[PDB]
């Protein structure tokens, strides 16, 4: 069986008005072989701003996290940046 890692990505909006539902739908629409989207929650980071924290399981040899982060960040209308909140081997 293939090596996997479970990753929790933080996806940040532009402001407190950003449509977070559209933002997460855009992330989940991203399809790649070896990529499995998991649970997500909108977490407050202060001053009314909420970030998207979403889990995903990736096959190490098939899914580039650098590329994945870059792809999410293409949704400029909703995403300011992305960061890895945490990652573990499975």
């Amino acid at each position: 069986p293939a090596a996997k890692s479970i990753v929790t990505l933080d996806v940040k909006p532009w402001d407190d008005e950003t449509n977070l539902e559209e933002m997460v739908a855009n992330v989940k629409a991203i399809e790649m072989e070896g990529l499995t989207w998991g649970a997500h929650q909108f977490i407050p980071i202060g001053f009314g701003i909420k970030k998207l924290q979403i889990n995903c399981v990736v096959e190490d040899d098939k899914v580039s996290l650098d590329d994945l982060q870059q792809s999410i960040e293409e949704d400029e209308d909703h995403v300011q940046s992305t960061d890895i909140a945490a990652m573990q081997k499975l």
């Binding site: 090596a3 996997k4 890692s5 479970i6 990753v7 929790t8 940040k12 532009w14 402001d15 407190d16 008005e17 499995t36 989207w37 998991g38 649970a39 977490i43 407050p44 980071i45 202060g46 001053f47 009314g48 701003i49 924290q53 889990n55 995903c56 399981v57 990736v58 190490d60 580039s64 996290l65 650098d66 300011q80 940046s81 960061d83 890895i84 909140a85 945490a86 990652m87 573990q88 081997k89 499975l90």
Partner: protein, 440 residues
């Protein structure tokens, strides 16, 4: 409150480190407990009710793979003395940068070693991911290490096999740089639980592990005692403020709100801060984290704070916030750092200008000059002005950032003194900043 420490668990794919780490989190923490509960109940089907923790761990893994579990990848567990934030090191190649510039650097590394003859040898290969991880930890100053020889059941808890493994592993880690005498070697069974939390009854010859510390010799029997014996590291609370920005928001009726992790010092409302490399100075109106407003943000806190007369446009990700009246952060003309070249399909010559990731900065920096090549472990200068670097070399290099950049010497501000060098879809080197030519 229990003190906080970070631990990274490394080892070869067949070492069984995931089951090992999972067992600790399962019995000493509370991660995805509702999933655990479901499987503990289901296990009644196996017989009349009895179940192995390793079975439950197996089912949790598959559940996580389906993407239906609820908890995030930030895992923690407790010991008598600590709340441990643990990372079962991913094999993923992108984890290398994350290990270098990510938050939560390790206070101790736990190397899990498979005891089987074939698996043991495969694990200490000179080109293995496990050695790279060990090297990275050592290079980043993770001086505390614990070794657990797993799968002792597969070699029938044989004392001689354990001793030979300790011998060869000591050689392995010594070449990396760790002094084996300070490393506890714990024979365990991650699957059967031997010496995990309770002492084993399968090895009469086992007297326990031991390690030399500065105060004396510490001994124990289990992996948990080994972890609990990790030495308390000193935190940056006392050093000047340093808060790398991750994001900057423009919130109506409030203004500019940068967000970032407090790496050193403390941020409080009322302080007057400066943002480097821009050089903008202002007062901190308020600070917030999650739902609560704070009286202070301490090292480790990812906080958002509000400042006035600062268009979001004048400060950005990568900039560093600090105290304007206590060694304020500054940009630099250049910085000299010890670079360790990792295994990669290439060779480095002066002029090389790859992207460098340092705290939240992502900037291409020129390897302006190859000042010296050094013995990696001792730091002794082997030659002046080497003409190129190849995998394995440790060297002092003069860097010139292509964009305004704020960095620190690793000795003074660790989180802003270590960096990852990216190229060929991988981290090709790791640097530790030794001096900075600041900007005035």
């Amino acid at each position: 409150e229990k003190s906080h420490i970070n631990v990274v668990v490394i080892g070869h794919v067949d070492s069984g480190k995931s089951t090992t780490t999972g067992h600790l989190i399962y019995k000493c923490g509370g991660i995805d407990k509702r999933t655990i509960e479901k499987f503990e109940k289901e296990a009644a089907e196996l017989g009349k009710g009895s179940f192995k923790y390793a079975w439950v761990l197996d089912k949790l893994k598959a559940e996580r793979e389906r993407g239906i579990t609820i908890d995030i990848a930030l895992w923690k567990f407790e010991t008598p003395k600590y709340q441990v934030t643990v990372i079962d090191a991913p094999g993923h190649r992108d984890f290398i940068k994350n290990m270098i510039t990510g938050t939560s650097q390790a206070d101790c590394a736990i190397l899990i070693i498979a005891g089987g003859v074939g698996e043991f040898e495969a694990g200490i290969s000179k080109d293995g991911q496990t050695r790279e991880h060990a090297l990275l930890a050592f290079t980043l100053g993770v001086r505390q290490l614990i070794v657990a020889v797993n799968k002792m059941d597969s070699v029938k808890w044989d004392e001689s096999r354990f001793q030979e493994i300790v011998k060869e592993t000591s050689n392995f880690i010594k070449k990396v740089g760790y002094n084996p005498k300070t490393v506890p070697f714990v024979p365990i069974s991650g699957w059967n639980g031997d010496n995990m939390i309770e002492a084993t009854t399968n090895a009469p010859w086992y007297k326990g592990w031991e390690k030399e510390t500065k105060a004396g010799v510490v001994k124990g029997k289990t992996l948990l005692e080994a972890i609990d014996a990790i030495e308390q590291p000193s935190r940056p609370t006392d050093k000047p403020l340093r808060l790398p920005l991750q994001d900057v928001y423009k919130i109506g009726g409030i203004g500019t709100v940068p967000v970032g992790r407090v790496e050193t010092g403390v941020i409080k409302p009322g302080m007057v801060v400066t943002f480097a490399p821009a050089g903008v100075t202002t007062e901190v109106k308020s600070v917030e984290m999650h739902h609560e407003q704070l009286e202070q943000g301490v090292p480790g806190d990812n906080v958002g704070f509000n400042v006035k007369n600062v268009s979001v446009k004048e400060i950005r990700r990568g900039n560093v916030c600090g105290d304007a009246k206590n060694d304020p952060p500054k940009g630099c003309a250049s910085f000299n750092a010890t670079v360790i070249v990792l295994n990669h399909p290439g060779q480095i010559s002066a002029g090389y200008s790859p992207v460098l990731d340092c705290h939240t900065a992502h900037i291409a920096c020129r390897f302006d000059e190859l000042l010296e090549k050094n013995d990696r472990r001792s730091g002794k200068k082997l030659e002046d002005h080497p003409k190129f670097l190849k995998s394995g070399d440790a060297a002092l290099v003069k860097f010139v950032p292509s964009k305004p950049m704020c960095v620190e010497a690793f000795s003074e501000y660790p989180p802003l003194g270590r960096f990852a060098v990216r190229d060929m879809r991988q981290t090709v080197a790791v640097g530790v900043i030794k001096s900075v030519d600041k900007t005035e």
